Amino acid sequence: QKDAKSSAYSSRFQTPFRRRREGKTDYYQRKRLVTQHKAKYNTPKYRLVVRFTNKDIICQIISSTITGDVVLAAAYSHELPRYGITHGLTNWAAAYATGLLIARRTLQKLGLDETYKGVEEVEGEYELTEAVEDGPRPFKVFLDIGLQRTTTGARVFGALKGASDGGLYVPHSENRFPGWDFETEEIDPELLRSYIFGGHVSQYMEELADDDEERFSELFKGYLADDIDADSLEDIYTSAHEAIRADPAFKPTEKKFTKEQYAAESKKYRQTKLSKEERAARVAAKIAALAGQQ
Amino acid sequence: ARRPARCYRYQKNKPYPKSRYNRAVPDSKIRIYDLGKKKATVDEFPLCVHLVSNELEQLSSEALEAARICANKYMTTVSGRDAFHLRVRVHPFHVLRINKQGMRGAWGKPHGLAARVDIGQIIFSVRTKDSNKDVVVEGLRRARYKFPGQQKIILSKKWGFTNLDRPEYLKKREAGEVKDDGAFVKFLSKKGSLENNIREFPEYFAAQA
Amino acid sequence: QNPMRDLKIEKLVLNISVGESGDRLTRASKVLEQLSGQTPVQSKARYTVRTFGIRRNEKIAVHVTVRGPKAEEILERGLKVKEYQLRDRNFSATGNFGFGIDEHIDLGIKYDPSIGIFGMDFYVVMNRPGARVTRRKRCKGTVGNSHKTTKEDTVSWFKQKYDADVLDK
Amino acid sequence: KEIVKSNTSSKKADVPPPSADPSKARKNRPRPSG
Amino acid sequence: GKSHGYRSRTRYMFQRDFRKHGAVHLSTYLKVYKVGDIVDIKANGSIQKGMPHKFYQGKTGVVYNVTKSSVGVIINKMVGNRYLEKRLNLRVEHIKHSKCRQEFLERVKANAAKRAEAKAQGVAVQLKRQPAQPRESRIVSTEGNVPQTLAPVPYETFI
RNA sequence: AAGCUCGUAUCAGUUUUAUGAGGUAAAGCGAAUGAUUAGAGGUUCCGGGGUCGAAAUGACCUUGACCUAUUCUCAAACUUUAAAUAUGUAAGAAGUCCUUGUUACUUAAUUGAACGUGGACAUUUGAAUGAAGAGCUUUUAGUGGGCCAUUUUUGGUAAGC
RNA sequence: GAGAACAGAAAUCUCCAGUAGAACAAAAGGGUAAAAGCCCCCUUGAUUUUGAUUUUCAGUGUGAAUACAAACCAUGAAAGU
RNA sequence: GGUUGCGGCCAUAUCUACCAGAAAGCACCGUUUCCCGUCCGAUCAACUGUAGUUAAGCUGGUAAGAGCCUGACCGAGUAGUGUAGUGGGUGACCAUACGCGAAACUCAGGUGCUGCAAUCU
Numbered sequence A: 001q002k003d004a005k006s007s008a009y010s011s012r013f014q015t016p017f018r019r020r021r022e023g024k025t026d027y028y029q030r031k032r033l034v035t036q037h038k039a040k041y042n043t044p045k046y047r048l049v050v051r052f053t054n055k056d057i058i059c060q061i062i063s064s065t066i067t068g069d070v071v072l073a074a075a076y077s078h079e080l081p082r083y084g085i086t087h088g089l090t091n092w093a094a095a096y097a098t099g100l101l102i103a104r105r106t107l108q109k110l111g112l113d114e115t116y117k118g119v120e121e122v123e124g125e126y127e128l129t130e131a132v133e134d135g136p137r138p139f140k141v142f143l144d145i146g147l148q149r150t151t152t153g154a155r156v157f158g159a160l161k162g163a164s165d166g167g168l169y170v171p172h173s174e175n176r177f178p179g180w181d182f183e184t185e186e187i188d189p190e191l192l193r194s195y196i197f198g199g200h201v202s203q204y205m206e207e208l209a210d211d212d213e214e215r216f217s218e219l220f221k222g223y224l225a226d227d228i229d230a231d232s233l234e235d236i237y238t239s240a241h242e243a244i245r246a247d248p249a250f251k252p253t254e255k256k257f258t259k260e261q262y263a264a265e266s267k268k269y270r271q272t273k274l275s276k277e278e279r280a281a282r283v284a285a286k287i288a289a290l291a292g293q294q
Numbered sequence B: 001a002r003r004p005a006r007c008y009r010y011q012k013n014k015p016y017p018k019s020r021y022n023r024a025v026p027d028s029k030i031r032i033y034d035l036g037k038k039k040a041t042v043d044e045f046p047l048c049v050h051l052v053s054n055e056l057e058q059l060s061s062e063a064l065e066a067a068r069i070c071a072n073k074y075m076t077t078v079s080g081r082d083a084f085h086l087r088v089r090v091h092p093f094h095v096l097r098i099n100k101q102g103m104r105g106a107w108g109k110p111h112g113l114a115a116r117v118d119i120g121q122i123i124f125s126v127r128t129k130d131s132n133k134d135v136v137v138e139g140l141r142r143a144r145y146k147f148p149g150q151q152k153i154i155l156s157k158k159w160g161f162t163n164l165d166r167p168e169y170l171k172k173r174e175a176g177e178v179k180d181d182g183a184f185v186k187f188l189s190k191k192g193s194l195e196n197n198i199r200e201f202p203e204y205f206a207a208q209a
Numbered sequence C: 001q002n003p004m005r006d007l008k009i010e011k012l013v014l015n016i017s018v019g020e021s022g023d024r025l026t027r028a029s030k031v032l033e034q035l036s037g038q039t040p041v042q043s044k045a046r047y048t049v050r051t052f053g054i055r056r057n058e059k060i061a062v063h064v065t066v067r068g069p070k071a072e073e074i075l076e077r078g079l080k081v082k083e084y085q086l087r088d089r090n091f092s093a094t095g096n097f098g099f100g101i102d103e104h105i106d107l108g109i110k111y112d113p114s115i116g117i118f119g120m121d122f123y124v125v126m127n128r129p130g131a132r133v134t135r136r137k138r139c140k141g142t143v144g145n146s147h148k149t150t151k152e153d154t155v156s157w158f159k160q161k162y163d164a165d166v167l168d169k
Numbered sequence D: 001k002e003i004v005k006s007n008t009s010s011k012k013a014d015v016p017p018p019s020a021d022p023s024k025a026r027k028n029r030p031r032p033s034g
Numbered sequence E: 001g002k003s004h005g006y007r008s009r010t011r012y013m014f015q016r017d018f019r020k021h022g023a024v025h026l027s028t029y030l031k032v033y034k035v036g037d038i039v040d041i042k043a044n045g046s047i048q049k050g051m052p053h054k055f056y057q058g059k060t061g062v063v064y065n066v067t068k069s070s071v072g073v074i075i076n077k078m079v080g081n082r083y084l085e086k087r088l089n090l091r092v093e094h095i096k097h098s099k100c101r102q103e104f105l106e107r108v109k110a111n112a113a114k115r116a117e118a119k120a121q122g123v124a125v126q127l128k129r130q131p132a133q134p135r136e137s138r139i140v141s142t143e144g145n146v147p148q149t150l151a152p153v154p155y156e157t158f159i
Numbered sequence F: 001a002a003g004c005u006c007g008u009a010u011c012a013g014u015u016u017u018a019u020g021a022g023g024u025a026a027a028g029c030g031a032a033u034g035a036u037u038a039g040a041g042g043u044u045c046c047g048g049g050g051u052c053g054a055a056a057u058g059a060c061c062u063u064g065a066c067c068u069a070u071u072c073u074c075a076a077a078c079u080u081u082a083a084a085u086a087u088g089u090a091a092g093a094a095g096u097c098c099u100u101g102u103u104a105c106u107u108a109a110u111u112g113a114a115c116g117u118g119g120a121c122a123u124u125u126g127a128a129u130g131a132a133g134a135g136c137u138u139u140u141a142g143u144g145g146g147c148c149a150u151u152u153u154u155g156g157u158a159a160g161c
Numbered sequence G: 001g002a003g004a005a006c007a008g009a010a011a012u013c014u015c016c017a018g019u020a021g022a023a024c025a026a027a028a029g030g031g032u033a034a035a036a037g038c039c040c041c042c043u044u045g046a047u048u049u050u051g052a053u054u055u056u057c058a059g060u061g062u063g064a065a066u067a068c069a070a071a072c073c074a075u076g077a078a079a080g081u
Numbered sequence H: 001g002g003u004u005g006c007g008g009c010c011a012u013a014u015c016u017a018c019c020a021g022a023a024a025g026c027a028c029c030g031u032u033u034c035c036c037g038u039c040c041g042a043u044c045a046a047c048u049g050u051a052g053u054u055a056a057g058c059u060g061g062u063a064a065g066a067g068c069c070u071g072a073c074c075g076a077g078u079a080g081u082g083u084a085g086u087g088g089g090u091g092a093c094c095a096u097a098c099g100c101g102a103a104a105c106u107c108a109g110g111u112g113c114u115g116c117a118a119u120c121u
């Protein structure tokens, strides 16, 4: 294509890591996350993996091994209809909810859930969950942004607040939470609390329903069909925090068919590739039409 | 100046070519390495004779030039300016030094060049038609007297300047596996993309015979 | 095989390359502000050339980037100035294209003799839906061969709408 | 108020680029006549 | 004047291998090191801190300490007519576990288990390797293989 | 020189096995860097001169430059590959396995990390060879112009340099 | 490479390619691509205490360097550095 | 078996061209009140999952494809080398003895493997 990469160029090309090629994995960040103090020997560094697809939220607790990464427990936003959120799966309150579920789900299966209650109050105030005296120390987990920007008020820190208010120790600071004012040099907990329950989404339903009925009909069409009122948003999340902290345990999907049935179908749409002998036919055949006139 | 060539005859030193470290070296006294009909087609000149070195030594760039001229002259005058292709197979990339107070700090400034030659390495090469063997031989034979040490003149089973002792070449010639390049040829590959291989060697395929 | 992929403008960047610092620069800067309705951005001289009278790091020029409908409206005003006639060069082999006018008053913009008269470079870049595949941080990728705005493609799109002419060739 | 564009290049020397020199111009070039 | 620096003459020694450059893969950070381990010191030129001096490149020794990013290693260096004990502080990118011990440990397991299956059956042990013994008497046949006799070859020029 | 502690104890200018390090020799240049001969094809609206056509932004003509695919020849301060000889470590009782004590370190955690009690396994006591013993201390002479041979090798035309 | 008034070889604006052919004060060599390079924000770990270790080595000094311990700081969302 | 999040080894995974992709996922995609960032809501931020599409990304297949990987009595026991001689040769240098033993070349084969969790007619 006039760029025409020479045989010599290709030969002296060194490939980046696979995950660097596909551009998923930052290995400058991953070296610093995973690396364990070596006088602490086999003690794992536990990451809080938060990721955002377009339609879903991924929250994973992850440790590392030479043979592979190993996840302790996982929580997705698509589980949230079980606890009462049927909408806004990619919004902030969803992250806070998903962060709380993974906070609760893990330390439950860790036997640390009863101790280290978490907050349960939710005024949106900055605190770590600090260790019990004469008792186990809180489960420590470190925030893994991935390739996400660090911006003040980014959804990923909604996951952070959810998990820290969930009782896990996930050290952090205020300034990337909504409500932090540079000039004021402080966090206003009001606005932060608002975002935990979706105050920013609800005020939009009201100003939109008032100013534009049609545009409002389009974005919130699911809310009109579900008879969900604008200011009822706080009760959907408040009550979801109940059921989540009530039943953190992960229930898997009901799994129509089986892994075997899926496989006998899900890709037999795979193109099976040719044998060497079939290839000698294709060569000798492709001869014919060009041998052909010439 | 030009101290005798007895002094630099033997390879006593690590190769010391013109480099970023060594500059201010003189020009080679041999420039032209191809003479005769140099654009003649590979088929023109089947017969290949070599001037081969039987020693391990350094040849001066001055003596390359002297013997180059020496061969070319007897070739053109006898058999004609177009009857042969003379290619010097050796290049003077090695720098001699002269000291030119005391032995104090005696490192040399560059005195001239020479070409490092090995046992059996080829120095001169000529291709002609078979009818001209005698003449080329006497050309090289006349040019041996310009070189130090012993060099042998070898009739080479091979086609021209290529490779592939003449029977083997002839099989590819009436094949279609031979495409004439400038002064040289390219050989049909069974490796590269089948598309441009058929356009590159239309005579082989196709029609294939 | 032609569903989404329509064609559109990525951005239109208006560029007045002034050639000096001071009054003239901030003046011609005002023109792009008062035109783009955005606030413009200044470029620094990459190096000193004495024949041009410019010193390195001195601010030569100002440009501005426009996107969306507002760009599509400023482009129209430019094409009027050229009378909807561009030339077959004029067009990047990568699909982009542009032109230039003199004396900016030739589209809107009354006069203000104290503000003055300046030409500008019009350059507009074409892309399709999916151009954030190459612009996004995560999973950056390269647009396929199909897609991939070409010069043949966007010359035809330039004749199809705007009802205008290619030239020469 | 005053925005300035960032320059990604690494070269800090105040020197012409490699392409600058009087060679490669033309005779013609524009040949303005009247 | 003469030049002997700390990195003097390491041009090729500390070069990184052809087409293996840049970032250090994570396995080297996940290895775990215990006092008394045997390690292979090969410096990594992309990591300048915790770097062995060129002498110890290729040398193998025991780790006497374990710290945050590094291990102390013990090497015996000969200076004069005796060896002197050296203690090295090296970052975990310059270090690897010796595979030589690893064969030995695996043979002690194998040796212990051989001695057990022998003592359970009350039979002879012989756990010490013998070197290759000369060979044993064979009868090679001629069926299918008739000795194909060979001759030296005339001189020929191929040029 | 004087001994001292002990004694098959451990030792070794050696091999064997296992496992590391190395960038010399050679090799390479239609593989990177740098040099080097020759023709061929293609591009130049993005060079010098065209002997037609006043037109010159026009076909056609030479010679540059670049591109592609080839060809002759190179490297102490080049290189993908890469020996030989040299070289590091290991071949157990100071080992291995079971059980379960200690701690202010460390872990979310009775987890780990160290150092232990008690129990098990000595035939070949975990390659070869040798070993005429091994280990250890004090104290002090003389010397600190060297030279030669083989091979490696630097300066020099070279030298009994 | 291909494009855009003045605009030229060389001003400034796109897009496309681009394994580093750049830059990292300086000699050269190594090293580095979501950086070790370019730009920006915040800083003073160029700080405190005394030990151990590597290179030259007599295993003296010196210069330089490496990893901790004990403080007090920086920075970041944090692991970390 | 597909697909996704986090990975291990880091081209058998890359490069070029052309095809193909059911279901889920992923994406592209719609929006600008709010936090947030811009010359520019392109990037970065936030909202909806609604109005659209597999066009691209992505995944697989195709190529006497470029590169990369592997194997061989392919070259070659060649080049280079440790050891020996009161071996040859004016010398250059070479042959023999006991050992070690390459690279290019040629041919042939291959074109990611896999770990944790989730999910899919």
Ligand SMILES: NC[C@H]1O[C@H](O[C@H]2[C@H](O[C@@H]3O[C@H](CO)[C@@H](O)[C@H](N)[C@H]3O)[C@@H](O)[C@H](N)C[C@@H]2N)[C@H](N)[C@@H](O)[C@@H]1O
Binding pocket: H081
């Ligand atoms: N290019 C020609 C090469 O020929 C020899 O190699 C021969 C080789 O020489 C040996 O080289 C070794 C080097 O130390 C040693 O074993 C002996 N000195 C020697 O007898 C002979 O034992 C072989 N029989 C033949 C081989 N051509 C030379 N050794 C090389 O230096 C020479 O450059």
Ligand SMILES: [Mg+2]
Binding pocket: none
């Ligand atoms: Mg190129």
Ligand SMILES: [Mg+2]
Binding pocket: A006, A007, A008
């Ligand atoms: Mg090629």
Ligand SMILES: [Mg+2]
Binding pocket: A029
């Ligand atoms: Mg980061």
Ligand SMILES: [Mg+2]
Binding pocket: A173
């Ligand atoms: Mg902080």
Ligand SMILES: [Mg+2]
Binding pocket: B012, B013
């Ligand atoms: Mg010499």
Ligand SMILES: [Mg+2]
Binding pocket: B144, B145, B146, B147, B148, B149, B150, B151
């Ligand atoms: Mg002679």
Ligand SMILES: [Mg+2]
Binding pocket: D007, D008, D009, D010, G038
């Ligand atoms: Mg800059």
Ligand SMILES: [Mg+2]
Binding pocket: E001, E002, E003
């Ligand atoms: Mg020196």
Ligand SMILES: [Mg+2]
Binding pocket: E012, E013, E015, E017
């Ligand atoms: Mg190496």
Ligand SMILES: [Mg+2]
Binding pocket: E017
């Ligand atoms: Mg290696």
Ligand SMILES: [Mg+2]
Binding pocket: none
């Ligand atoms: Mg440092």
Ligand SMILES: [Mg+2]
Binding pocket: none
């Ligand atoms: Mg060599």
Ligand SMILES: [Mg+2]
Binding pocket: F027, F028, F081, H103, H104
């Ligand atoms: Mg090679």
Ligand SMILES: [Mg+2]
Binding pocket: F030
């Ligand atoms: Mg070649």
Ligand SMILES: [Mg+2]
Binding pocket: none
């Ligand atoms: Mg030509």
